[PDB]
mmCIF file of C-alpha atoms in Angstrom:
data_model
loop_
_atom_site.group_PDB
_atom_site.id
_atom_site.type_symbol
_atom_site.label_atom_id
_atom_site.label_comp_id
_atom_site.label_asym_id
_atom_site.label_seq_id
_atom_site.Cartn_x
_atom_site.Cartn_y
_atom_site.Cartn_z
ATOM 1 C CA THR A 1 -22.973 134.736 -116.706
ATOM 2 C CA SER A 2 -23.644 131.051 -114.923
ATOM 3 C CA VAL A 3 -26.564 128.501 -116.742
ATOM 4 C CA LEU A 4 -27.205 125.220 -115.890
ATOM 5 C CA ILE A 5 -28.370 122.820 -118.468
ATOM 6 C CA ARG A 6 -31.123 121.048 -117.499
ATOM 7 C CA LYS A 7 -33.144 117.885 -118.573
ATOM 8 C CA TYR A 8 -36.342 117.228 -117.451
ATOM 9 C CA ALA A 9 -39.556 114.482 -117.622
ATOM 10 C CA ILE A 10 -42.958 116.461 -118.686
ATOM 11 C CA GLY A 11 -45.058 115.415 -115.665
ATOM 12 C CA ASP A 12 -42.616 114.356 -113.148
ATOM 13 C CA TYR A 13 -40.426 116.537 -111.755
ATOM 14 C CA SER A 14 -39.328 114.277 -109.031
ATOM 15 C CA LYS A 15 -35.609 113.718 -110.311
ATOM 16 C CA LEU A 16 -33.540 115.295 -112.868
ATOM 17 C CA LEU A 17 -33.557 113.180 -117.132
ATOM 18 C CA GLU A 18 -30.576 111.429 -117.782
ATOM 19 C CA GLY A 19 -29.178 110.158 -120.680
ATOM 20 C CA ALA A 20 -30.468 112.794 -123.517
ATOM 21 C CA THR A 21 -27.508 113.639 -125.607
ATOM 22 C CA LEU A 22 -28.023 117.512 -125.645
ATOM 23 C CA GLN A 23 -26.074 120.736 -128.578
ATOM 24 C CA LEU A 24 -25.097 124.107 -127.543
ATOM 25 C CA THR A 25 -24.109 126.686 -130.711
ATOM 26 C CA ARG A 26 -20.108 121.608 -127.059
ATOM 27 C CA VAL A 27 -22.270 117.893 -126.643
ATOM 28 C CA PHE A 28 -22.817 116.495 -123.486
ATOM 29 C CA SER A 29 -25.057 113.909 -121.965
ATOM 30 C CA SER A 30 -27.656 115.111 -119.599
ATOM 31 C CA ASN A 31 -27.245 114.462 -115.495
ATOM 32 C CA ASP A 32 -28.602 114.744 -112.492
ATOM 33 C CA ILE A 33 -28.390 117.942 -111.254
ATOM 34 C CA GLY A 34 -27.124 120.179 -114.669
ATOM 35 C CA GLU A 35 -24.528 121.405 -116.694
ATOM 36 C CA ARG A 36 -22.810 124.673 -115.561
ATOM 37 C CA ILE A 37 -21.456 126.781 -118.602
ATOM 38 C CA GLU A 38 -19.930 130.242 -118.111
ATOM 39 C CA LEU A 39 -21.140 132.176 -121.040
ATOM 40 C CA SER A 40 -20.819 135.850 -122.307
ATOM 41 C CA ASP A 41 -23.860 137.556 -124.034
ATOM 42 C CA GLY A 42 -24.723 136.557 -127.929
ATOM 43 C CA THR A 43 -27.878 134.455 -128.623
ATOM 44 C CA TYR A 44 -27.986 130.585 -128.132
ATOM 45 C CA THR A 45 -29.278 127.108 -129.135
ATOM 46 C CA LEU A 46 -30.095 123.903 -127.471
ATOM 47 C CA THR A 47 -30.509 121.127 -129.681
ATOM 48 C CA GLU A 48 -31.066 117.888 -128.632
ATOM 49 C CA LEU A 49 -29.782 114.655 -130.908
ATOM 50 C CA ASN A 50 -30.596 112.332 -128.966
ATOM 51 C CA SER A 51 -33.674 111.628 -126.522
ATOM 52 C CA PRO A 52 -33.119 108.604 -123.936
ATOM 53 C CA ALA A 53 -34.766 105.611 -123.548
ATOM 54 C CA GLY A 54 -39.424 105.986 -124.016
ATOM 55 C CA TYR A 55 -38.557 109.845 -124.831
ATOM 56 C CA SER A 56 -39.220 111.910 -127.751
ATOM 57 C CA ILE A 57 -36.752 114.326 -129.191
ATOM 58 C CA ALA A 58 -37.810 117.793 -127.538
ATOM 59 C CA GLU A 59 -37.372 120.888 -130.068
ATOM 60 C CA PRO A 60 -34.778 123.282 -129.790
ATOM 61 C CA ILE A 61 -34.378 126.120 -126.883
ATOM 62 C CA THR A 62 -33.294 129.492 -128.278
ATOM 63 C CA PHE A 63 -32.017 132.136 -125.620
ATOM 64 C CA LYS A 64 -30.182 135.050 -125.118
ATOM 65 C CA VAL A 65 -27.435 136.189 -122.832
ATOM 66 C CA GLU A 66 -27.016 140.049 -121.886
ATOM 67 C CA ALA A 67 -26.217 142.088 -119.092
ATOM 68 C CA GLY A 68 -25.969 139.416 -115.756
ATOM 69 C CA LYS A 69 -29.936 138.388 -117.587
ATOM 70 C CA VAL A 70 -30.956 135.123 -119.859
ATOM 71 C CA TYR A 71 -34.336 135.276 -121.239
ATOM 72 C CA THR A 72 -36.013 132.551 -123.481
ATOM 73 C CA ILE A 73 -37.083 133.317 -126.930
ATOM 74 C CA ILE A 74 -40.104 131.651 -128.999
ATOM 75 C CA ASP A 75 -42.314 132.268 -131.479
ATOM 76 C CA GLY A 76 -40.882 136.656 -132.236
ATOM 77 C CA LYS A 77 -41.135 136.545 -128.294
ATOM 78 C CA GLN A 78 -38.603 137.551 -125.475
ATOM 79 C CA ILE A 79 -38.834 136.964 -122.064
ATOM 80 C CA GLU A 80 -36.880 136.506 -118.839
ATOM 81 C CA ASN A 81 -35.710 133.360 -117.565
ATOM 82 C CA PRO A 82 -38.590 131.799 -115.927
ATOM 83 C CA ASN A 83 -36.244 128.871 -114.465
ATOM 84 C CA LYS A 84 -34.307 130.413 -112.150
ATOM 85 C CA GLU A 85 -33.143 126.578 -109.211
ATOM 86 C CA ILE A 86 -30.912 126.187 -106.594
ATOM 87 C CA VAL A 87 -27.551 124.657 -107.550
ATOM 88 C CA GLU A 88 -27.665 120.936 -105.553
ATOM 89 C CA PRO A 89 -31.284 119.846 -106.597
ATOM 90 C CA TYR A 90 -33.662 118.553 -104.091
ATOM 91 C CA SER A 91 -31.556 119.679 -100.871
ATOM 92 C CA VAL A 92 -34.102 122.239 -99.509
ATOM 93 C CA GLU A 93 -35.518 120.382 -96.231
ATOM 94 C CA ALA A 94 -39.977 121.328 -96.011
ATOM 95 C CA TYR A 95 -41.788 119.625 -93.346
ATOM 96 C CA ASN A 96 -45.732 119.458 -91.727
ATOM 97 C CA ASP A 97 -45.631 121.621 -87.704
ATOM 98 C CA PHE A 98 -46.747 118.725 -85.594
ATOM 99 C CA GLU A 99 -46.088 120.793 -82.888
ATOM 100 C CA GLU A 100 -48.227 123.347 -83.658
ATOM 101 C CA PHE A 101 -51.653 122.663 -82.768
ATOM 102 C CA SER A 102 -54.425 125.281 -83.313
ATOM 103 C CA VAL A 103 -57.867 124.704 -83.946
ATOM 104 C CA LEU A 104 -59.814 125.579 -87.003
ATOM 105 C CA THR A 105 -63.237 125.992 -85.929
ATOM 106 C CA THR A 106 -62.745 122.517 -83.380
ATOM 107 C CA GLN A 107 -60.506 120.723 -84.837
ATOM 108 C CA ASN A 108 -56.752 121.035 -84.531
ATOM 109 C CA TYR A 109 -56.107 122.414 -89.004
ATOM 110 C CA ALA A 110 -52.947 120.387 -88.582
ATOM 111 C CA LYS A 111 -52.010 121.581 -91.923
ATOM 112 C CA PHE A 112 -48.966 124.237 -91.151
ATOM 113 C CA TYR A 113 -46.630 123.369 -93.748
ATOM 114 C CA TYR A 114 -42.823 125.335 -93.938
ATOM 115 C CA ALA A 115 -39.923 124.894 -95.977
ATOM 116 C CA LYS A 116 -36.426 126.011 -94.851
ATOM 117 C CA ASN A 117 -34.752 128.933 -96.494
ATOM 118 C CA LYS A 118 -31.125 127.966 -96.931
ATOM 119 C CA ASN A 119 -30.001 130.543 -93.736
ATOM 120 C CA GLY A 120 -32.426 128.845 -91.295
ATOM 121 C CA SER A 121 -35.111 129.999 -90.970
ATOM 122 C CA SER A 122 -38.293 129.034 -92.121
ATOM 123 C CA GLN A 123 -40.796 130.199 -94.183
ATOM 124 C CA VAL A 124 -44.910 129.489 -94.281
ATOM 125 C CA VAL A 125 -46.391 127.637 -97.729
ATOM 126 C CA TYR A 126 -49.421 125.597 -99.408
ATOM 127 C CA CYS A 127 -49.753 122.760 -101.117
ATOM 128 C CA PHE A 128 -50.077 122.923 -104.452
ATOM 129 C CA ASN A 129 -51.870 119.791 -104.901
ATOM 130 C CA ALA A 130 -55.065 118.776 -102.809
ATOM 131 C CA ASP A 131 -54.270 115.192 -103.531
ATOM 132 C CA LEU A 132 -50.755 114.228 -102.956
ATOM 133 C CA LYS A 133 -48.806 113.244 -99.309
ATOM 134 C CA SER A 134 -48.212 116.772 -97.673
ATOM 135 C CA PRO A 135 -44.482 117.591 -95.980
ATOM 136 C CA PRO A 136 -42.667 115.467 -93.949
ATOM 137 C CA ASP A 137 -44.480 115.656 -90.517
ATOM 138 C CA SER A 138 -41.770 117.094 -87.888
ATOM 139 C CA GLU A 139 -42.906 116.366 -83.826
ATOM 140 C CA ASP A 140 -40.675 119.066 -82.767
ATOM 141 C CA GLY A 141 -42.117 121.927 -85.558
ATOM 142 C CA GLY A 142 -38.714 121.776 -87.316
ATOM 143 C CA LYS A 143 -36.216 122.022 -84.981
ATOM 144 C CA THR A 144 -34.297 118.771 -86.210
ATOM 145 C CA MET A 145 -34.724 117.210 -89.290
ATOM 146 C CA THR A 146 -37.211 114.592 -90.008
ATOM 147 C CA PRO A 147 -36.015 110.836 -90.797
ATOM 148 C CA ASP A 148 -37.142 111.649 -94.121
ATOM 149 C CA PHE A 149 -35.414 114.623 -95.403
ATOM 150 C CA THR A 150 -32.240 113.404 -93.735
ATOM 151 C CA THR A 151 -32.456 109.642 -95.043
ATOM 152 C CA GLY A 152 -32.902 111.682 -98.338
ATOM 153 C CA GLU A 153 -36.959 109.926 -98.810
ATOM 154 C CA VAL A 154 -38.417 113.463 -98.828
ATOM 155 C CA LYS A 155 -36.141 116.604 -99.809
ATOM 156 C CA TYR A 156 -37.176 119.594 -102.458
ATOM 157 C CA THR A 157 -35.571 121.466 -104.943
ATOM 158 C CA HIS A 158 -36.524 125.271 -104.548
ATOM 159 C CA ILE A 159 -37.746 127.478 -107.882
ATOM 160 C CA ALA A 160 -38.552 130.879 -108.729
ATOM 161 C CA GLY A 161 -42.077 130.424 -108.639
ATOM 162 C CA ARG A 162 -43.158 131.018 -112.531
ATOM 163 C CA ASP A 163 -44.225 128.359 -115.119
ATOM 164 C CA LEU A 164 -46.100 127.191 -112.177
ATOM 165 C CA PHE A 165 -48.996 125.696 -114.303
ATOM 166 C CA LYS A 166 -47.389 122.068 -115.015
ATOM 167 C CA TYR A 167 -47.204 121.113 -111.739
ATOM 168 C CA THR A 168 -51.499 121.864 -111.061
ATOM 169 C CA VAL A 169 -53.632 118.111 -111.483
ATOM 170 C CA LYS A 170 -57.075 119.588 -111.989
ATOM 171 C CA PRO A 171 -56.228 123.969 -112.758
ATOM 172 C CA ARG A 172 -58.660 126.225 -113.251
ATOM 173 C CA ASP A 173 -57.137 128.174 -115.394
ATOM 174 C CA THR A 174 -56.255 127.662 -118.909
ATOM 175 C CA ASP A 175 -53.909 129.983 -119.318
ATOM 176 C CA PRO A 176 -50.857 130.171 -117.624
ATOM 177 C CA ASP A 177 -49.830 133.249 -116.858
ATOM 178 C CA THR A 178 -53.409 134.273 -115.725
ATOM 179 C CA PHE A 179 -53.057 130.902 -113.569
ATOM 180 C CA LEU A 180 -49.559 132.566 -111.967
ATOM 181 C CA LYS A 181 -51.365 136.122 -111.718
ATOM 182 C CA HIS A 182 -54.034 134.495 -109.616
ATOM 183 C CA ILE A 183 -51.877 132.429 -106.982
ATOM 184 C CA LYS A 184 -49.816 135.159 -106.340
ATOM 185 C CA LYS A 185 -52.830 137.293 -105.071
ATOM 186 C CA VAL A 186 -54.106 134.744 -103.270
ATOM 187 C CA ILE A 187 -50.105 134.567 -101.829
ATOM 188 C CA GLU A 188 -50.571 138.680 -101.545
ATOM 189 C CA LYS A 189 -53.750 138.918 -99.288
ATOM 190 C CA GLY A 190 -53.655 136.055 -97.829
ATOM 191 C CA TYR A 191 -51.469 134.566 -94.668
ATOM 192 C CA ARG A 192 -48.052 134.931 -95.193
ATOM 193 C CA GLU A 193 -46.021 135.879 -91.323
ATOM 194 C CA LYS A 194 -46.307 133.988 -88.080
ATOM 195 C CA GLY A 195 -48.222 137.522 -86.409
ATOM 196 C CA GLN A 196 -48.992 139.215 -89.115
ATOM 197 C CA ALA A 197 -52.292 141.212 -88.758
ATOM 198 C CA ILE A 198 -55.203 139.899 -89.204
ATOM 199 C CA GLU A 199 -57.951 142.949 -90.848
ATOM 200 C CA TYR A 200 -61.069 140.194 -90.979
ATOM 201 C CA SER A 201 -62.969 140.900 -87.888
ATOM 202 C CA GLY A 202 -63.540 137.486 -86.088
ATOM 203 C CA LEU A 203 -60.855 135.360 -87.892
ATOM 204 C CA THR A 204 -57.713 134.059 -86.055
ATOM 205 C CA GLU A 205 -54.354 133.497 -87.921
ATOM 206 C CA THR A 206 -55.130 129.745 -88.559
ATOM 207 C CA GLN A 207 -58.659 130.558 -90.347
ATOM 208 C CA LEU A 208 -56.581 132.526 -92.324
ATOM 209 C CA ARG A 209 -53.544 130.222 -92.987
ATOM 210 C CA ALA A 210 -56.697 127.671 -94.316
ATOM 211 C CA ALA A 211 -58.920 130.513 -96.053
ATOM 212 C CA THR A 212 -54.945 131.160 -97.959
ATOM 213 C CA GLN A 213 -54.820 126.855 -98.285
ATOM 214 C CA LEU A 214 -58.355 126.485 -99.778
ATOM 215 C CA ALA A 215 -57.823 129.328 -102.243
ATOM 216 C CA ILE A 216 -54.783 127.953 -103.658
ATOM 217 C CA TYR A 217 -56.419 124.438 -104.084
ATOM 218 C CA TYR A 218 -59.765 126.589 -105.340
ATOM 219 C CA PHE A 219 -56.919 127.129 -108.953
ATOM 220 C CA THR A 220 -54.712 124.349 -108.396
ATOM 221 C CA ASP A 221 -57.335 121.400 -107.971
ATOM 222 C CA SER A 222 -60.664 123.423 -108.712
ATOM 223 C CA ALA A 223 -62.634 123.011 -104.778
ATOM 224 C CA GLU A 224 -65.259 124.766 -104.636
ATOM 225 C CA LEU A 225 -66.224 127.278 -101.843
ATOM 226 C CA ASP A 226 -69.078 125.330 -101.359
ATOM 227 C CA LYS A 227 -70.044 124.295 -97.055
ATOM 228 C CA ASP A 228 -71.760 120.885 -98.595
ATOM 229 C CA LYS A 229 -69.111 119.911 -101.356
ATOM 230 C CA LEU A 230 -66.355 121.274 -98.465
ATOM 231 C CA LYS A 231 -67.947 118.498 -96.162
ATOM 232 C CA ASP A 232 -65.093 115.490 -96.717
ATOM 233 C CA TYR A 233 -62.461 117.721 -98.399
ATOM 234 C CA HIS A 234 -59.491 117.650 -96.669
ATOM 235 C CA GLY A 235 -60.538 118.313 -93.616
ATOM 236 C CA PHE A 236 -61.713 121.944 -94.968
ATOM 237 C CA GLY A 237 -65.523 120.158 -93.726
ATOM 238 C CA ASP A 238 -64.224 122.264 -89.854
ATOM 239 C CA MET A 239 -63.783 125.509 -91.564
ATOM 240 C CA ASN A 240 -67.135 128.210 -90.192
ATOM 241 C CA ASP A 241 -69.401 130.580 -92.665
ATOM 242 C CA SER A 242 -66.459 133.270 -91.939
ATOM 243 C CA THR A 243 -63.616 131.767 -92.494
ATOM 244 C CA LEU A 244 -64.930 130.119 -96.220
ATOM 245 C CA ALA A 245 -66.314 133.720 -96.697
ATOM 246 C CA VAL A 246 -62.619 134.761 -96.945
ATOM 247 C CA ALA A 247 -61.640 132.111 -98.336
ATOM 248 C CA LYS A 248 -64.269 133.651 -101.659
ATOM 249 C CA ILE A 249 -63.086 137.052 -101.221
ATOM 250 C CA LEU A 250 -59.398 135.868 -101.639
ATOM 251 C CA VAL A 251 -60.478 134.188 -104.780
ATOM 252 C CA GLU A 252 -62.467 136.752 -106.195
ATOM 253 C CA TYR A 253 -59.490 139.429 -105.274
ATOM 254 C CA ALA A 254 -57.140 136.705 -107.029
ATOM 255 C CA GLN A 255 -59.227 136.727 -109.759
ATOM 256 C CA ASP A 256 -60.181 140.372 -110.471
ATOM 257 C CA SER A 257 -57.991 142.422 -113.812
ATOM 258 C CA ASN A 258 -55.706 143.730 -111.307
ATOM 259 C CA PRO A 259 -51.827 143.074 -111.806
ATOM 260 C CA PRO A 260 -50.306 141.358 -108.424
ATOM 261 C CA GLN A 261 -48.441 143.430 -105.968
ATOM 262 C CA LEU A 262 -45.800 140.839 -104.760
ATOM 263 C CA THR A 263 -42.379 140.448 -107.407
ATOM 264 C CA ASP A 264 -40.878 136.992 -106.903
ATOM 265 C CA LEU A 265 -42.136 134.225 -104.997
ATOM 266 C CA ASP A 266 -40.415 131.054 -103.749
ATOM 267 C CA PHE A 267 -41.469 127.572 -104.823
ATOM 268 C CA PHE A 268 -41.001 123.490 -103.908
ATOM 269 C CA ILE A 269 -40.741 120.504 -105.764
ATOM 270 C CA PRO A 270 -40.285 117.272 -103.806
ATOM 271 C CA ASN A 271 -37.989 114.532 -105.277
ATOM 272 C CA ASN A 272 -41.264 111.617 -104.497
ATOM 273 C CA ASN A 273 -44.123 112.270 -107.115
ATOM 274 C CA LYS A 274 -46.552 111.461 -104.549
ATOM 275 C CA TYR A 275 -45.460 114.323 -102.168
ATOM 276 C CA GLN A 276 -47.438 118.294 -103.223
ATOM 277 C CA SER A 277 -44.976 120.839 -104.531
ATOM 278 C CA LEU A 278 -45.283 123.813 -102.431
ATOM 279 C CA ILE A 279 -45.468 127.107 -102.947
ATOM 280 C CA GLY A 280 -43.942 129.661 -100.521
ATOM 281 C CA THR A 281 -45.021 133.121 -99.353
ATOM 282 C CA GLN A 282 -41.381 134.883 -99.321
ATOM 283 C CA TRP A 283 -38.679 135.617 -101.948
ATOM 284 C CA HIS A 284 -35.143 134.528 -101.903
ATOM 285 C CA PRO A 285 -33.120 134.930 -105.085
ATOM 286 C CA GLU A 286 -29.688 134.865 -103.747
ATOM 287 C CA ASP A 287 -29.348 131.616 -104.370
ATOM 288 C CA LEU A 288 -31.822 130.691 -107.729
ATOM 289 C CA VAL A 289 -29.244 130.388 -110.838
ATOM 290 C CA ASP A 290 -30.183 130.868 -114.523
ATOM 291 C CA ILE A 291 -31.972 126.493 -115.406
ATOM 292 C CA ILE A 292 -31.873 126.474 -119.157
ATOM 293 C CA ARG A 293 -34.938 123.916 -119.070
ATOM 294 C CA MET A 294 -35.665 121.505 -122.001
ATOM 295 C CA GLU A 295 -38.739 118.708 -120.965
ATOM 296 C CA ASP A 296 -38.826 115.566 -123.195
ATOM 297 C CA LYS A 297 -42.595 114.179 -123.381
ATOM 298 C CA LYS A 298 -42.682 110.395 -122.388
ATOM 299 C CA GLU A 299 -43.854 107.710 -125.295
ATOM 300 C CA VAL A 300 -46.053 104.768 -124.182
ATOM 301 C CA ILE A 301 -46.344 102.695 -126.765
ATOM 302 C CA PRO A 302 -48.709 100.552 -126.132
ATOM 303 C CA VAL A 303 -47.477 97.026 -125.100
ATOM 304 C CA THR A 304 -47.957 94.801 -128.260
#
């Protein structure tokens, strides 16, 4: 089974962290794409022999390879590897479709966000960080690559939508597994596909899309589903009463005790920390490989 060892800096996933001296029980230096290793079945340990400058030594990672599957093992618990990522990081395009015009109530929603799948199709995505920059504007609705993607200024890593709590700025939740369940349930009952059947009476596709986006913000950024609070909140002032009631339905479903009906979703992380990460609406496992992810805490010593 193929694995890629990747070193990251906690709180800034815009690039891999190079210069970490790492040891697999092989010694190597963490690089910018990852260290590829084909391994047969057994139990392995990754140890940071030396951190880069300004970073602390991370705890060792124990993982098991067994029959084409990888499992991370932390304190009496064995879980399927949460980190499944594309081999070429920061190489996928996402865009905001400026060609698409459709009102939320009276104004253009103007938040029609998409990611490009490997085969050139597109999937609806939602912003995961209300305060950060939306994916590059595309005047022609994704038909051509934006200059931000082509120049390499804004590109995304496609990962499996697991271990997502770390990407949030003001999470409502305190438990990452509960958080993941909430997110998967909003997506499940929300707007997933152009042309889908909208079952809520009177609602348009754009209105369900908006309600879905706000329901995501409810969990990622602790947005309040209150008309008076939404007045000046990222355009949601234009959301009508019926549409906010559906946002509330999405949230209340997500919060209920039932397990998510879907399994895994695509997620996308930018190579620019000013840009939002994005939660997807589809699942493309074909390009994802097992990552052994290790993350380093930056030190912050007061300059005296």
